[PDB]
Design a protein around this ligand. Structure first.
Ligand SMILES: O=c1ccn([C@@H]2O[C@H](COP(=O)(O)OP(=O)(O)O)[C@@H](O)[C@H]2O)c(=O)[nH]1
Ligand SMILES: CCCCCCCCCCCCCC(=O)O
Ligand SMILES: [Cl-]
Ligand SMILES: [Zn+2]
Ligand SMILES: [Zn+2]
Ligand SMILES: [Zn+2]
Ligand SMILES: [Zn+2]
Length: 267
């Protein structure tokens, strides 16, 4: 595929899910070979694994004293559309959460794609790898296409289930929203997070219930969202990725751990 940028400046704004603060996003076109980077208070922060500063309840980036929370959703959309050269200017401390999915980013950017004058240099998984953490497991292996499977095993009604993304099925995952369990809310608030969370941007689930009156868009919506998150974290390899991935109960911390091991092996 050819390198891509946006045809013009695109704007997005709203509350950040963790900070509870209003922020604003300006996506700027860039020339061939620039890569994906964030820009904040005069500082460029590359969308790369070396710049990850926190992974507990979001993927956060930082450099030279400037930090940006919650980059996983904008990065997943850029990965899915193969946008390879852009600057994401952030006025604020967090990416806006919007409805908790990738849909608004996806629809706006999809309409404004500009093919450029270079063949993409893909990060291609060259051999099988497995990373583990206390129950959680991710494996990666060589493939001509990006294929991503998440298997969840949840302690509520969701139980054990599985969803697989393959290339060409981007529309199946960009609408899936971020989710939280009711028993997790106290912890999240107590560590100084979740300040912008509500039923308008978060699916809140109990042992037996869905609090959002709109309910779930899909029966496996949370698992589709986890696939969407992993594709965002994978873009921290610095280029679009070619590989087959299986994740059992993974989250941002394990995703970033796999990315770091893949990077140092050097694919
Ligand atoms: O299939 C799963 C199951 C759990 N989790 C998350 O990972 C954490 C692990 O929780 P666990 O069931 O292991 O019990 P805990 O470690 O919180 O005591 C939970 O907060 C879940 O939000 C997940 O991402 N995928
Ligand atoms: C109805 C208001 C309650 C919302 C408070 C919870 C805040 C949502 C936190 C999002 C969960 C983290 C997801 C993640 O990034 O891995
Ligand atoms: Cl924490
Ligand atoms: Zn090509
Ligand atoms: Zn925590
Ligand atoms: Zn997240
Ligand atoms: Zn997410």
């Amino acid at each position: 595929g050819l390198e891509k940028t946006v045809k013009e400046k695109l704007s997005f704004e709203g509350v950040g899910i963790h900070t509870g603060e209003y922020s604003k996003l300006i996506i700027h076109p860039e020339k061939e070979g620039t890569g994906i980077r964030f820009f904040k208070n005069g500082v460029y922060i590359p969308a790369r694994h070396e710049f990850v500063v926190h992974t507990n309840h979001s993927t956060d980036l930082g450099f030279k004293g400037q930090r940006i929370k919650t980059v996983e959703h904008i990065l997943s959309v850029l990965h899915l559309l193969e946008i390879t050269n852009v600057t994401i200017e952030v006025i604020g401390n967090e990416i806006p959460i919007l409805d908790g999915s990738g849909w608004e980013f996806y629809e706006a950017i999809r309409k404004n794609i500009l093919n450029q004058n270079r063949e993409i240099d893909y990060f291609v998984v060259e051999e099988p790898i497995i990373v583990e953490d206390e129950g959680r497991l991710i494996k990666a292996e060589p493939s001509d296409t990006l294929e991503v499977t998440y298997e969840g095993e949840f302690k509520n009604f969701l139980g054990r289930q599985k969803f697989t993304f393959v290339e060409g099925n981007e529309e199946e995952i960009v609408l899936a929203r971020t989710f939280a369990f009711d028993w997790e809310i106290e912890h999240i608030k107590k560590v100084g997070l979740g300040k912008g969370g509500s039923l308008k941007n978060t699916l809140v689930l109990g042992k037996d219930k869905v609090y959002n009156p709109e309910g779930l868009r899909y029966e496996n919506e949370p698992v589709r969202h986890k696939v969407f998150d992993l594709i965002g974290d994978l873009y921290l390899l610095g280029s679009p990725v070619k590989g087959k991935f299986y994740s059992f109960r993974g989250g941002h911390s394990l995703n970033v751990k796999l990315v770091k091991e893949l990077a140092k092996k050097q694919k």
